[PDB]
Amino acid sequence: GSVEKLTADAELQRLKNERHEEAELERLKSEY
Amino acid sequence: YVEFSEECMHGSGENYDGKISKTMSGLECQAWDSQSPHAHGYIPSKFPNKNLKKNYCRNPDRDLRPWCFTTDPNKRWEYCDIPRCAA
């Protein structure tokens, strides 16, 4: 459908979740 | 009387409409209306109701604490170390 789950709250969560993955990904990325 | 915005977290801190633009580490926050350096989907046009403004530490998505994007190329986002109020 659209590039959104048709609700801001869901997009909010998704982007938050995205960033949250980023943090864990960054944490995995950063050894030293 | 909202002139006194208060610099603690009330609720999730979504309603923190303070003008703190520096993060928990004191880094410079990236303006929500900017895509530099970090291209982000937090467009104030798509989340207008969240008062997503300037490079101020805001909480639109209901994170555990208000936060901000970092202007640091390495750091995508940063938390903002805001006090916590009882309510």
Residue B27 main-chain phi, psi, to 5 deg: -80, 165
Q: Do B63 and A11 touch (CB under 8 A)?
A: no
Q: Do B60 and A12 touch (CB under 8 A)?
A: yes
Q: Could you tell me if B60 lies within 8 Å of chain A, comparing CB atoms?
A: yes
Range of the domain at B22: 1-87
Nearest to A18 by CA among B30, B63, B14, B52: B63
Nearest to B58 by CA among B71, B49, B67: B67
- Nearest Cβ partner for B76 among A8, A13, A22: A22
Q: Do A12 and B61 touch (CB under 8 A)?
A: yes
CATH at B72: 2.40.20.10
DSSP code for B31: P
Residue type for position B70: T
User: Which own/partner pairs from B41-47 qualify as long-range (CB within 8 Å, at least 24 positions apart)?
Assistant: B41/A11, B41/A15, B41/A18, B42/A15, B42/B69, B46/A8, B46/A11, B47/A8, B47/A11, B47/A12
Residue type for position B22: K
DSSP code for B41: S
What's the number of domains chain B is made of? 1
